[PDB]
Amino acid sequence: RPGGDTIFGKIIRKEIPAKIIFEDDRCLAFHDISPQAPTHFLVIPKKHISQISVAEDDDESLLGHLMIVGKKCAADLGLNKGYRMVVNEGSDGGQSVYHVHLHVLGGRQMHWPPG
Amino acid sequence: GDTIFGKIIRKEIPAKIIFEDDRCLAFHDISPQAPTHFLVIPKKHISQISVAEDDDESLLGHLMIVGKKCAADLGLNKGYRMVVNEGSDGGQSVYHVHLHVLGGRQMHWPPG
Ligand SMILES: Nc1nc2c(ncn2[C@@H]2O[C@H](COC(=O)NCCc3ccccc3)[C@@H](O)[C@H]2O)c(=O)[nH]1
């Protein structure tokens, strides 16, 4: 099945519900079920890539598309004071779902360091 | 408006450069928040991710591919975290788009 069978692949295929913000042929933006900020959503490719460390050179445009969609959705959600985008890789990065995803967090002051 | 990152791109002040090509520069952060903490920045002066244009898509993805390749070269085989800050709530420190890459320790949740 296209997108794989991680939770995110299931969400892509509408097999598990999610609160969807934006969708096109390349990606899907939807709210995180365990938000860490007043607004916290995810932007994921529909193509299954397990983690950023194995992304191909030819995935550049797709990965950049995640960030463009991320910043457009943030504007559409009224995050006028800004926001933080996060990609987690592997264990030290805190990755728990092995389908590439961009976190977008806003609606509060984010602190430094970023975890 | 020029920034300190523009001076670093122009080699006017020193930085510990990891990698460079015709469109981006990777270098260690001067105030590292992890045992390995570097930045990947485009040479094009995009002030902040919120003003990036659609035609910048592949350039932004290039920052992430360069970042993941540099992370591997720096031996971050247990993982790492990539961060882009926007605006005051995002804690953006320099108004030149930059991708943070942090590893060498457990990164925690929430990410700030
Ligand atoms: N909408 C939605 N979101 C989901 C779902 N299942 C997971 N997520 C989110 O995916 C994200 C995956 O993030 C990371 O892999 N690492 C973050 C640390 C982290 C690690 C572990 C847990 C929560 C958070 C998390 O924010 C989850 O809350 C779901 O069914 N629906």
The 10 Å Cβ neighbour count of residue B68 is: 23
The 10 Å Cβ neighbour count of residue A7 is: 15
List the structure tokens of A31: 């709210």
The 10 Å Cβ neighbour count of residue B110 is: 19
CATH topology of domain A1-115: HIT family, subunit A (3.30.428)
**Residue that the structure tokens 């244009």 belong to:** B53
**Residue length, chain A?**
115
Resolution (A): 1.8
Contact B68 A62 (CB under 8 A): no
Experimental method: X-ray
Torsions phi, psi of A22, nearest 5? -155, 145
User: Cβ(A57)–Cβ(A19) under 8 Å?
Assistant: no
Share in percent of chain A as helix, strand, coil (round to 5): 30, 25, 45
CATH architecture of B1-112: 2-Layer Sandwich (3.30)
Interval between CA A34 and ligand 1 midpoint (Å): 7
Q: Would residue A101 show up in a list of annotated catalytic residues for this protein?
A: yes
For chain B, the structural domain boundaries read 1-112
Interval between CA A58 and ligand 1 midpoint (Å): 26
Best of A5, A7, A19, A34 for a ligand 1 pocket test (most atoms within 8 Å of beta carbon): A34
Q: What order do you get walking across the sheet with A83-89 strand by strand? A: A20-23, A27-31, A39-45, A102-106, A83-89, B80-86, B99-103, B36-42, B24-28, B17-20
Contact A62 B64 (CB under 8 A): no
Please compute Rg for chain B using Cα positions. 13
Contact A89 B68 (CB under 8 A): yes
Q: How far is CA A94 from CA A51, A91, A114, in A?
A: 12, 5, 12
User: Exposed, middle or buried by CB within 10 Å (0-12, 13-18, 19+), for B45?
Assistant: middle
Angle of CA points A30, A34, A37, to nearest 5° = 85
Q: How far is CA B1 from CA A81, B19, B45, B48, B49, in A?
A: 20, 25, 9, 12, 16
